[PDB]
Task: structure prediction
Amino acid sequence: KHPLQNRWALWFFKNDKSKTWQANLRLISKFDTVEDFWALYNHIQLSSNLMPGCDYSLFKDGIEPMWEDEKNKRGGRWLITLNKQQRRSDLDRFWLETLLCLIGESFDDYSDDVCGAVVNVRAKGDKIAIWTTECENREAVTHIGRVYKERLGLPPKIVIGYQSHADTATNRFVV
Amino acid sequence: ACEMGFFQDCG
Ligand code: NA
Result:
């Protein structure tokens, strides 16, 4: 087993409006090796086969999948916007790519600024996002944005945005 | 705006 730099937690949020968000939010399991990650990924439903309104997230061990968390409070997210027609082609490969960027610590020195990632499966269009700790850190947010977009292999004409959680609750940067 | 991370709008 090949150890990861960090221990990660995979969360699932169920769309069931006959239950509270607490009851619909589930911590599936945690892992700190490549082998344990792959074992987990291959025993859970692909993002593309989730029922509408359902979410996955991966956060560093100790960070709650909530913007009100101390590590997310003053942070934000790089948002990837996928249309209906992209789900079969892009959603799973982009979500897998995102998870590998997290566990692989692919953002060099600014990897510590990474809190986690979220995928939203919605009828109107899906979303992936990488969550960072501080939206004030311009070098960190900009470096993460550039590396992430390159790793997804998105062209220039697809402009991705970074929004602070403060603004979302109520684009600071683009690449 | 009910989604993972922003549960205040899920009430
Ligand atoms: Na399987």
User: Anything to note?
Assistant: The radius of gyration of chain B is 5 Å. Residues A 42-43 surround sodium ion (CB under 6 Å). Chain B touches chain A through nine residues (CB under 8 Å). DSSP finds no helices and no strands in chain B.
